[PDB]
Amino acid sequence: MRVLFIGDVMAEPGLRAVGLHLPDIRDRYDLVIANGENAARGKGLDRRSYRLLREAGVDLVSLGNHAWDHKEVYALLESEPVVRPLNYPPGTPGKGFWRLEVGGESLLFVQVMGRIFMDPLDDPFRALDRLLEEEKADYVLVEVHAEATSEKMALAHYLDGRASAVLGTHTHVPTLDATRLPKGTLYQTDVGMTGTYHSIIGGEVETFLARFLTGRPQPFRAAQGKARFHATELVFEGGRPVAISPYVWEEP
């Protein structure tokens, strides 16, 4: 099977890039997965954004810690192809994984959340052991939403030979390190954000700068401008991880 994972869809720019370009390339994949944690104006996921992602060809959407920003996410999380970090404590709405079926083969998608430099949560390492224990598929893709590169790599290595591929997100900047670990698992530190980089982490330049220059609070505002579409191609065949390719498209 051929899978395309779309990195963090920011606000309008991110949504526009996906809706504008994905249709032109959907023919090339069996499944498309995209992180839509900030798909709604730069904060949370809402019904509108979700429908737009799906209409562009997205089969499954992952979140992050900005997942509870909208009340519209709960409805989505319980009846739609949407997943929040598995890493969350018991009694947390939604699912931490999703099983995708395609042409006789299955793919288990798991999103997990890093802990260093972030809010304390369940051990992502052992949460993955428990999940891989009771859930089997031909291929396993694990999204590591985290700040620390070492933590992402520690998870990749801990998952080597078990997961088919491990892709990191949340850092909003694409990495040039796509490779395969010793036991054959594909890995990339960060797929990057899809949205406009004519910003600072997707936020409005002056607003974030003021945030850094004054040390005082600043209303979050999403930047607007031409965007970039960042995703990573993954090929899985023979129960094996075959290739990983960072992809990029620019809004004319």
By CB under 8 A, name the one of 28, 213, 237, 240 that touches its own copies: 213
- Strands 139-145, 105-113: pairing is parallel
For the chain, the C-alpha Rg in angstroms (whole number) is 17
* Site map (CB under 8 A) of its own copies, residues 104-143, x = contact: -------------x-------x------------------
User: Per rule CB under 8 A, is residue 250 in the interface with its own copies?
Assistant: no
Our CA angle for 126, 127, 132, nearest 5°, is 95
User: Per rule CB under 8 A, is residue 237 in the interface with its own copies?
Assistant: no
User: φ and ψ at 76, to 5 degrees?
Assistant: -60, -50
Cβ–Cβ under 8 Å, residues 107 and 31: yes
Nearest to 178 by CA among 241, 114, 90, 240: 241
As a whole number of angstroms, the distance between CA 14 and CA 196 comes to 7
Nearest to 10 by CA among 212, 207, 232, 169: 169
By CB under 8 A, name the one of 192, 229, 234, 236 that touches its own copies: 192
38 is in an annotated binding site: yes
* Site map (CB under 8 A) of its own copies, residues 140-159, x = contact: -------xxxxx-xxx-xx-
* 66 a catalytic residue: yes
User: Per rule CB under 8 A, is residue 252 in the interface with its own copies?
Assistant: no
Active site residues per annotation:
66
Give me the residues that bind its own copies (CB under 8 A), please. 117, 125, 147-151, 153-155, 157-158, 171-177, 179, 182, 189-190, 192, 197-201, 203, 205, 208-209, 211-213, 246, 248
